[PDB]
């Protein structure tokens, strides 16, 4: 569900220099698992809100479960 040039550009912004050919399938799987978790939490929030349509607020609330990862201790 993600095109290969998008994967290459995302790796470029991350500082990756050389990429093996097996990276694409692995990163597609990683994206799929992450989106499955986030959509699961968003749907839980939407059902708690007694609605049949997921909005941006539900996604924002769902993103809070994954936590925050920042460099250092700030």
């Amino acid at each position: 569900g993600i095109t290969k040039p998008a994967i290459r550009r995302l790796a470029r912004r991350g500082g990756v220099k050389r990429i093996s050919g097996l990276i694409y399938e692995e990163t597609r799987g990683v994206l799929k698992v992450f989106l499955e978790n986030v959509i699961r939490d968003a749907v839980t929030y939407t059902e708690h809100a007694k609605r049949k349509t997921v909005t941006a607020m539900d996604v924002v609330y769902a993103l809070k479960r994954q936590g925050r990862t920042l460099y250092g201790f700030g």
Binding site: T3, K4, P5, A6, R8, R9, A11, R12, V16, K17, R18, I19, S20, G21, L22, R51, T53, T55, A56, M57, V60
Partner: protein, 1047 residues
């Protein structure tokens, strides 16, 4: 070569989905199946994508062989579409490779484009146009060579293909024309006109794609088309008035004329190009529609050139002085009005309506009494078309002639109300027209709507309380919102019913009432803005409803008009938005980055590859930063921008600015998040979005400054300094570099609003004042790029445009704000250079409005400068003295105010003129009849008495003889400060006592004035107290009761 790539029967799906996809359950090596025509087209289309996806995996061994195969193919093709596809493939190969990495394609282009064979020239120009279009920046060095080639080729009128493709090349190269390349393009322009004239009758589509080149050449920042303006305008008029021609080409030509007028309108005014322009435009406006058919705007239940001709007339009015347009248009218009044909009346009414925009003042003071032309004639015209035109014209009149049209309400309102009553239900189009006119008239009435309030409320509650079509309820809701705007505080008696109707609309979840949901939210916001305290208990409940509809259905017009609702509610709720501030800060930032407005349109060959290369190698292609392996220009058949998302941004920017200004404490954690995106919008290609972003950043600065005042912490002031250092340079860079004039006025207004609020924080970095003053002096000197450098060449000091006066006034309004921020000590050298322009604006014989504005600006700059006006009093005194000798109320009032404040803040160098200054105020006091000017003379006399060196040796008695302060309550502070500056108070006792007695009830009078009197009463209560008994005896006993009340 058994490749069955053609549709065959309607079972082409049986081919595509089944075959050529089962490779797994080497084709690149022989993708040169040159067997039958347009199968080569399929092959080239597939090969383009295949090579786009896997160019870097072919190394270099077969690169040269493939390039040679493609070049050999390009020299033998006979058709056109497949030749274009091969050119696309060649350009794709060129685009991903280097400029000099393909040294034979350039040789082929150079050899073919100078060949003596017509097919060779056509194939060379087609390939050249495609290659240049693909990578425009590659041909940056050889502008002169490519322009010479284009000039040579465009002279071949025999072959339309060469003309069309050379014009496409010009389209691609036009934006990147440098100053040194101007003579070649100037020489080429007549050839472009000849090519256009040849290509117009052959085909409409090619004519449009070459009008693309003409439009790109119109605005290029270099003087390319100015020397041939007469010829270009003649060609545009010749093609525009061809009634037998198509509508699309005429619309494109009218847009070209609009751009010609906008870029340079003064050039065609000096020459005799305007009368032919009007004589060609007006018949298009009054063009008879096909018999049986009707105009698009007059349908019972954009396309025609009529609207675009009206738009051209509007743009001509905006960018031209009325004194040079009205005398040349009024005869034609007046002849049009008194015509038998109804469409002549329609054209006249439309032209007058759009002339009321850019010529607002000329119509407003001098041509507004002849309002009988619209209301009394077209509104009751036998023809319905004339009635619709009259309604639109009345709406434009009541929306542009804002202050001087409310005086005619007594005679306009009854007929408009009768017209609304006359419209039967089920005619929602006519009702919409009439309601537009009614709302536009009502919004400006203000207090005048109170006599007509019950009738309007009954009329608008007839629709809502009774069964009616959903289209006829949003119109009533909009009219109700306009009435609410008009009657800010007189709407309380009808408030509960209106509120319950709006709540009933909002609560009900029926799917056919979406537009009335939008209008209900909008009118709820309008009510929140207009009516105040009684809505505060119910304001909290409105936030839940606003977000409730914003998360049920996704609509750009629903997310908008909800941000406006919260902006309105933030005014009265205050800091109550904190629980909802997170939810309204998100879902708003996402709207700010929403790119759904630009939706691509794809009309071409369907994609049948649907295959991705599988490899396990170690890819090294990342070394090239600019990867061109992504999908670029996949048969883009143009774009279709939706005009509802940019209108969402223009309003959400203002809403978030207002929310930040109002909620100034709870918005801090989100201010940084919103600021970055609002700044990112500053480069948007949309006029209104840029204006809204520029107006929103200033509100962010004001909100952050007031937050810093709330909590004087180091992080707050550091953030304020960073925000100012990020905004003010953007404001200064967008004034003398941005072409759109509507943005420049908004930027100047925002800069004035920042300098007044932020104050000294703006000018703290060194050297900021030196460039801010330079910018404001460049706007007044017409040196900025937004004014087109006085419309090119020079001027002979003639009457400028009507809409540029507003720009100059906005530029000059920031001088008082700038003076109050620099402290006056450091602003004197810059005011020395600022003075000549303002003096020239107030020179005898100029415009009255400019005179008054210049005098008021001088007075306010004196106020800001303060004690640093000692060296400027000598220059300023003659100007103010001469201005105070005129026969205009506002101008003379401003002159007296400025002279008085100069006396107050002039210091020692202004003291020597005191006897002369007093020798002139006495004659003005008696002769003048207006209440405003005598009050300003009173204030000037008071201030002059304040700046007494030692004592005043009567001015005091004559000043205290009359105190008619009615319309200038802001002078009461000076009047009160006048008292108690330290014996003859017996004679002047009755008038000051009666003034105090009458002003006791009124709260508009500052309390400090009353406190001043008590000091002098008590100070004199001991020495010479016998006179108080005589004063009390002289006063009437009725005033004596109120006198004894205070003790």
């Amino acid at each position: 070569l058994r490749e069955l790539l053609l549709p065959d029967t309607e079972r082409i799906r049986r081919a595509t989905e089944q075959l050529q996809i089962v490779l797994r359950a080497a084709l690149c090596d022989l993708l040169a199946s040159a067997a039958d025509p347009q199968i080569r087209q399929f092959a080239a289309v597939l090969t383009r994508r295949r090579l786009n996806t896997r160019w870097r995996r072919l190394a270099a061994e077969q690169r040269e062989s493939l390039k040679s195969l493609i070049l050999t193919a390009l020299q033998r093709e006979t058709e056109h579409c497949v030749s274009l596809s091969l050119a696309q493939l060649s350009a794709t190969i060129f685009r991903k490779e280097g400029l000099e990495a393909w040294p034979q394609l350039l040789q082929l282009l150079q050899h073919s484009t100078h060949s003596p064979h017509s097919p060779e020239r056509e194939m060379g120009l087609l390939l050249l146009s495609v290659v240049v279009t693909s990578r425009p920046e590659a041909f940056q060095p050889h502008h002169r060579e490519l322009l010479r080639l284009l000039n040579e080729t465009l002279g071949e009128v025999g072959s339309p293909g060469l003309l069309f493709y050379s014009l496409r090349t010009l389209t691609t190269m036009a934006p990147y024309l440098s100053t040194e390349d101007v003579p070649l393009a100037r020489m080429l322009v007549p050839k472009l006109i000849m090519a256009m004239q040849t290509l117009i009758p052959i085909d409409e589509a090619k004519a449009c794609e070459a009008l693309e080149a003409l439009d790109e050449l119109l605005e290029s920042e270099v003087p390319v088309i100015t020397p041939y303006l007469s010829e270009v305008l003649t060609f545009c008029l010749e093609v525009a008035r061809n009634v037998a021609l198509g509508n699309a080409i005429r619309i494109r030509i009218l847009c070209c004329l609009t751009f010609l007028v906008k870029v340079k309108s003064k050039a065609l005014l000096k020459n005799r190009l305007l009368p032919p322009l009007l004589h060609t435009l007006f018949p298009i406006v009054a063009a008879e529609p096909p018999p049986g058919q009707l105009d698009p705007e007059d349908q019972d239940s954009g396309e025609t050139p009529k609207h675009f001709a009206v738009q051209v007339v509007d743009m001509l009015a905006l960018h031209l002085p009325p004194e040079k347009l009205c005398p040349q248009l009024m005869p034609m218009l007046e002849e049009a009005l008194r015509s038998e044909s109804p469409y002549q009346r329609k054209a006249g009414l439309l032209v007058l309506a759009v002339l009321s925009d850019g010529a607002g003042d000329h119509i407003r003071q001098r041509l507004l009494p002849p309002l009988l032309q619209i209301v009394c004639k077209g509104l009751e015209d036998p023809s319905q078309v004339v009635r619709n035109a009259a309604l639109f014209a009345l709406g434009q009149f009541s929306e542009n002639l804002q202050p001087h049209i409310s005086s005619y309400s007594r005679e306009v309102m009854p007929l408009l109300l009768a017209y609304l009553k006359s419209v039967p239900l089920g005619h929602t189009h006519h009702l919409a027209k009439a309601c537009y006119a009614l709302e536009n008239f009502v919004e400006n009435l203000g207090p005048k709507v109170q006599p007509y309030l019950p009738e309007l409320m009954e009329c608008m509650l007839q629709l809502l309380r009774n069964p009616s079509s959903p289209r006829a309820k949003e119109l009533a809701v909009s009219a109700l919102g306009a009435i609410a705007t008009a009657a800010q505080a007189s709407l309380l008696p009808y408030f509960p019913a209106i509120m319950e109707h709006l709540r009933e609309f909002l609560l009900t979840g029926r799917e056919d009432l979406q537009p009335v949901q939008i209008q209900s939210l909008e009118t709820l916001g309008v009510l929140a803005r207009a009516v105040g305290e009684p809505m505060r208990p119910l304001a909290e409940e409105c936030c839940q409803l606003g977000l409730g509809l914003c998360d049920q259905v996704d609509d750009p017009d629903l997310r908008r008009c909800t941000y406006s609702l919260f902006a309105a509610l933030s005014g009265l709720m205050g800091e109550g938005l904190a629980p909802h501030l997170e939810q309204i800060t998100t879902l708003m930032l996402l709207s700010l980055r929403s790119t759904e407005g630009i939706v691509p349109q794809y009309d071409g060959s369907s994609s049948f590859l649907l295959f991705d290369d599988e490899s396990d190698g170690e890819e090294e292609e990342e070394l090239m930063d600019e990867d061109v392996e992504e999908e670029d220009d996949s048969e883009i058949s143009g774009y279709s921008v939706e005009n509802a998302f940019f209108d969402e941004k223009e309003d959400t920017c203002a809403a978030v600015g207002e929310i930040s200004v109002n909620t100034s404490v709870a918005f801090l954690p989100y201010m940084e998040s919103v600021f970055e995106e609002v700044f990112k919008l500053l480069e948007c290609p949309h006029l209104n979005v840029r204006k809204a972003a520029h107006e929103a950043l200033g509100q962010f600065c004001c909100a952050l400054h007031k937050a810093c005042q709330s909590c004087p912490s180091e992080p707050n002031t550091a953030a304020l300094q960073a925000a100012l250092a990020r905004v003010v340079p953007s404001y200064m860079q967008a004034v003398n570099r941005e072409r759109e004039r509507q943005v420049v006025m908004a930027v100047l207004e925002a800069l004035t609003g920042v300098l007044r609020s932020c104050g000294t924080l703006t000018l703290k970095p060194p050297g900021r004042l030196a460039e801010l003053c330079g910018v404001l002096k460049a706007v007044l000197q017409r040196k900025t790029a937004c004014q087109d450098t006085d419309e090119e060449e020079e001027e002979e000091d003639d009457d400028q445009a009507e809409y540029d006066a507003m720009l100059l006034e906005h530029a000059g309004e920031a001088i008082p704000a700038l003076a109050a921020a620099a402290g006056g000590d450091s602003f004197a050298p810059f005011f020395a250079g600022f003075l000549p322009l303002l003096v020239c604006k107030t020179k005898q014989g100029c415009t009255v409005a400019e005179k008054s504005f210049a005098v008021g600006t001088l007075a306010e700059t004196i106020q800001g400068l303060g004690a640093a006006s000692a060296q400027f009093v000598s220059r300023l005194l003659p100007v103010l003295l001469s201005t105070a000798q005129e026969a205009d109320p506002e101008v003379r009032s401003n002159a007296i105010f400025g002279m008085g404040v100069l006396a107050e803040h002039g210091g020692h160098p202004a003291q020597e003129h005191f006897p002369k200054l007093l020798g002139l105020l006495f004659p003005l006091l008696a002769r003048e009849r207006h209440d405003r000017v005598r009050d300003n003379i009173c204030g000037a006399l008071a201030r002059l008495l304040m700046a007494s060196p030692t004592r005043k040796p009567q001015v005091l008695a004559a000043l205290l003889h009359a105190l008619p302060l009615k319309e200038d309550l802001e002078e009461w502070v000076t009047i009160g400060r006048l008292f108690s500056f330290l014996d003859q108070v017996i004679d002047v006792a009755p008038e000051l006592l009666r003034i105090c007695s009458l002003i006791l009830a009124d709260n508009k009078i500052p309390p400090d004035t009353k406190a001043a009197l008590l000091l002098l009463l008590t100070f004199l209560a001991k020495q010479h107290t016998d006179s108080f008994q005589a004063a009390l005896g002289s006063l009437p006993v009725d005033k004596a009761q109120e006198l004894q009340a205070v003790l």
